[PDB]
Amino acid sequence: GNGRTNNFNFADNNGNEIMEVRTQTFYQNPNNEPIAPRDIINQILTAPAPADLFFKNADINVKFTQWFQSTLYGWNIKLGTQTVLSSRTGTIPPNYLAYDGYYIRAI
Amino acid sequence: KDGLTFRNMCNLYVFPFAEAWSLMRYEGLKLQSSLSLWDYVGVSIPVNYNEWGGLVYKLLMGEVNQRLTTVKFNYSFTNEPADIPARENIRGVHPIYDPSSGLTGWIGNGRTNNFNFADNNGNEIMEVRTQTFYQNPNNEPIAPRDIINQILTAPAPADLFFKNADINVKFTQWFQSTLYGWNIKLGTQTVLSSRTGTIPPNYLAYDGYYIRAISACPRGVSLAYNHDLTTLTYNRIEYDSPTTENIIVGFAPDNTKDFYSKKSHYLSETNDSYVIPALQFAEVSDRSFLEDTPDQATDGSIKFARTFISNEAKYSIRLNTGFNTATRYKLIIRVRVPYRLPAGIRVQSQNSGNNRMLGSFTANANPEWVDFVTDAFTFNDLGITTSSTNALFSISSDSLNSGEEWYLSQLFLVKESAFTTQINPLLK
Amino acid sequence: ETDYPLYNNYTEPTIAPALIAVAPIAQYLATAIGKWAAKAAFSKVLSLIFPGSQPATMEKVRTEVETLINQKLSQDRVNILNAEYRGIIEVSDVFDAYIKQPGFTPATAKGYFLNLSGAIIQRLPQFEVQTYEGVSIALFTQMCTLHLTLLKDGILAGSAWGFTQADVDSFIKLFNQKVLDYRTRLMRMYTEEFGRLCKVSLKDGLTFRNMCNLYVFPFAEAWSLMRYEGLKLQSSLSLWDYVGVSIPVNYNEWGGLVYKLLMGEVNQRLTTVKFNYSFTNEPADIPARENIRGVHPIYDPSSGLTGWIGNGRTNNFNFADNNGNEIMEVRTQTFYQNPNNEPIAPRDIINQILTAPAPADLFFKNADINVKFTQWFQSTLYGWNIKLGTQTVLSSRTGTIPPNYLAYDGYYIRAISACPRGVSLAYNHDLTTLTYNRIEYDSPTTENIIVGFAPDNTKDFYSKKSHYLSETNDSYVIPALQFAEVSDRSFLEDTPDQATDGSIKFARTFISNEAKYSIRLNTGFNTATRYKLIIRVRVPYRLPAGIRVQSQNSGNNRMLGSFTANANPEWVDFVTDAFTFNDLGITTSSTNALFSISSDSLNSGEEWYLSQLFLVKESAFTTQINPLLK
């Protein structure tokens, strides 16, 4: 798909490669008091193979939502016993990907 | 900064005596100075003398008859390069006096991002923080980089005014490039502690003075524009510049503390002489400019150059309890009239429609300063008592022509008994 | 869709404002306000409203109103209204026929007069059904005009029509009651329909207000001048053309922000207008599109009050107004390269600031602004065409767009503004004043242009900045908004019933509240003639200092009047004592003469309203119906 995380062209340079970019925005309303900081995160999740070379199962799922004729998404990613991504948009039901007598070879 | 230092010296050692010279021919007037002392903290910026009297001083004063109610700073911090140490920038200053007027604007830059989402969706933007993370295979420590752009806000204290400040700036060199660090504290409110390390304090205080204005100077931009537009009212008092990197604090003597608190000149029976500076007015006409006349021992004078309707300036007067209204008084007006005015100058007393004419003076061409003395009057003839809250003294003149102007400096109110001219000015 | 030319958003040209069906009624109303003909004005009003005892003119009025406001009436409602018309016509014919007989019996005339008044009162409410109010508010108006006229004449011809003194007093009381009740009900209908249509869309509310400015409000103002004799009946309302998309506007938002943005500097001439234009066709599938991002009307070049109505930004480099010269246009051209194909389609992205200064004759007389819509996968694309006068400001790059002629015979373009789109309009209400505070509102786009046309009777003020007086004329009317200078914390209040573009609301709690007007005298003006001033004010809260009218002339300040201000929610007229221009020290060479209406400072939450000034000779002025006898 797309491995880019920003528009500064500073992806893989200066020795260490970029991993995560988090922008937090704060507002101020005179008539109100609660402050809702807005988060914008763009990161690269990494998952190496287990000690036994192969993953045996996975728990990957996606949740849909509608909002004024526009579909919003939420993701849940887990390979083996390593939780790769828990959904920030609320709990998502698990989707067990497994076949007795099979192992994960490609993703 | 050096010019401000020299002017601060002259305000204490030179100009008060120059003003005292102009009052030796009379007897009974009050010798009072209202000049301000200006502290400058930041980098060096060259300023022409045409640019000082046409823009810089107007930006330093702002609303010349209003109390400072809020001050906002545009703060920027960044350490994205791993080799360059952390740095801080002051991008703009916004002093807010009258909350319902909207005259003073940003002196530097009020922008925080390039999304154009500054003041929208009800709540205005306040802070933007970007945190960047890296990953090195050969190393293990991770140094997250921070980029912060925020708007610091400081309202006036409970006692309306700040008495002192602790603002300082620290310089650093790095491959022929200067990095900065800032420390800002107004009164007891810590506005900004430096993230680039500890910075020694710089106490800004003068015994007998209080903080009246906080402004800045534009850096990196031409200061030769909007001279004829920067007036005392109507037009927006602002100037766009990417950064300022400087903060200027004005201290005013305590003899002006009552005006910026009560918005009116209160009169006591015990005192004999009263001096009213021109800039301490209730309202002023359009197309009026602030002229730097430091020799008058005041923060300036009013230059009228409006070629329509009229040129008028009003001052609010209030009487304390125990004031005798049967005592005779006189008014002295200090004006400079380079061009002849066929209608002359007029001093009028307005009180809830009880408008009385105090004086009409023939205005002839004269490049020097002139004093006009009115006839004797009593406060019973003006219909003013201890309960009057809309009494006004109005100095007015007709409309001018193109290229013409006339200057008003100060007003002197003194009892008839204690006033006497000793040296005649007409015998030249 | 339609590619035919348009005429002020209508498919066929509209009737001139002086050629509408209610024009002779208004002309004779003004003539009678100038000098009322006793026991004869009602017959003329009846002949003008019902010519030949026929309701054909009222049907023409109904058809014209239905054409303007895009609202038609059912046939049953038409039959009911015509039946009411004939019912009134019968009694009116009886009365008018019995009057003209030389030597009639006055008691019989009294009986017929009472019958006619009662019949009009009885049949009035048929035009007050709110479900059709937007169409009937015009018709209703004329009917009230037929009644308030009647009573008026009845008060003048007392014993001639068999009226005792108690009869005349009762008629005066009924007149003083009805002249308020009718105005209240008419304003109810107007405000209801206007708020509803504005909650629908701003364009429809503007259309309804344009209709009411020609068919409703002038007569409502004429009602408030029938008790006097010698004043001038003059309307200064503006006609507003709206071109663009639909934007809902609340009634709290109209009177607190939108109208203030439409007027701008209410006493200044338009000198320049700037538009923020955006064009782009970067996607190869989506056709070209154009956007109006903001409008900036500049009146007084040395003031700096009016700001951008939409968005004046052109890029995200923050390099807008810097390095001496300001940015004007940014054009990005992108090129591609396909191996399987050969044609190359360069993509253009333009963001510029179009500038249009006022013509040599200070004002634009007409405009040709139009917008074209397009659909594409449930997304609306726009194209714009802008032309002010003879200067082509913007020709559409997205294809030809049919012209939309914006013109009114007897009107000229005075203001050009816009409405913010996509943002809340509930902020900066208490800050948007007539002066000092910046008249602006930030919004990413507007996608709308609003042009205001003002009648030619105001063309002299916006050119000479002063009110010139002639010896030949008898009465002069000065609107409040045509001032020389105004105090702080003053607001623009929409009072369309005054036949003016608004009134001044004073709410300053310090110093004073003052408004000055500049007066100049033409050669041949008699300074020995006696005059009087009439001030129209609304004072909801008591003012212990009262209102004061003063004459200031180069320091020769004289007091013309001091009036006690008591709490009154209705409109009040204050008349000064007689004076001559020699007592004011004003001649044909005076260029700094000023009339000042002033009051002391107010308290929190208080305000008072000033509407208009009337200057009339003492000989030609006389109050006929007493207002205090309520």
Author numbering:
A (entry chain A): 323 to 429
B (entry chain A): 216 to 643
C (entry chain A): 14 to 643
Q: Please, what does the article write about this entry?
A:
Cyt1Aa, Cry11Aa, and co-crystallized Cry4Aa and Cry4Ba. These are produced during sporulation and are remarkably stable in a variety of conditions, but dissolve after ingestion under the high alkaline pH levels characteristic of the larval mosquito midgut. Cry11Aa and Cry11Ba structures maintain the three-domain organization characteristic of Cry δ-endotoxins.
We first tampered with the interface enabling the brick-wall packing of Cry11Aa tetramers (interface #2) by introducing a F17Y substitution, intended to induce electrostatic repulsion with the negatively charged D180 (distance D180(OD1)—F17(CZ) of 3.3 Å) due to deprotonation of its hydroxyl group upon pH increase. As expected, crystals of the F17Y mutant were found to be more sensitive to increases in pH, with crystals starting to dissolve at pH as low as ~9.5 and an SP50 of 10.6 ± 1.0. The dissolution profile of F17Y crystals is again characterized by a reduced slope, as compared to WT crystals, explaining that the plateau is nonetheless reached at the same pH (~pH 11.6). The F17Y mutation was also found to challenge crystal formation, yielding crystals far smaller than their WT counterparts. To evaluate the significance of these changes, we characterized the distribution in size of crystals of Cry11Aa-WT, Y449F, F17Y and E583Q using AFM. All three mutants had a significantly reduced volume compared to WT Cry11Aa, due to a reduced thickness of the crystals. The structures of the other three mutants were determined, using the WT structure as a molecular replacement model for the phasing of diffraction data. We found that neither overall packing, tertiary structure nor interface formation is affected in the tested mutants at neutral pH.
